[PDB]
Amino acid sequence: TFVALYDYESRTETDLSFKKGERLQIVNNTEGDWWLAHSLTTGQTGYIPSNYVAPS
């Protein structure tokens, strides 16, 4: 259960843009700075940056 520390304003149709305070179900990540998360609201996927999130 990670948390968006920064407002990600993605501009592509792949990564989902989120805001601060929004929770994101992290999926796989432990090598680069880009991880894949899944929002528990609508049920979609969106690669969220690690600099805009952290374990909390």
Partner: peptide, 9 residues
């Protein structure tokens, strides 16, 4: 994939 420029600050 240059990471997003953190909010200036």
């Amino acid at each position: 994939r240059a990471l997003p420029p953190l909010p200036r600050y």
